[PDB]
Amino acid sequence: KAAMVVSEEDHLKAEARGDMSEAELLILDEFTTLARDLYAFYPLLIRF
Q1: Anything noted about its domains?
Q2: Interatomic CA distance for residues 8 and 1, integer angstroms
Q3: What does each C-alpha distance from 29 to 34, 43, 44, 46, 47 come to in angstroms?
Q4: Would you give the distance in Å from CA 43 to the centre of its chain?
């Protein structure tokens, strides 16, 4: 998940043309999802 979101972000940033902050909003929702997944699993992972 982290790899995909970061890679789409990098491709977006490379393709600077046109209105991009919309796709950045979509990827920021995806990143909020990803950080939520991290704060769901990584606490148990750290404890383990």
Answers
A1: The calcium release channel activity resides in the C-terminal region while the remaining part of the protein resides in the cytoplasm.
A2: 11
A3: 9, 21, 24, 25, 28
A4: 19
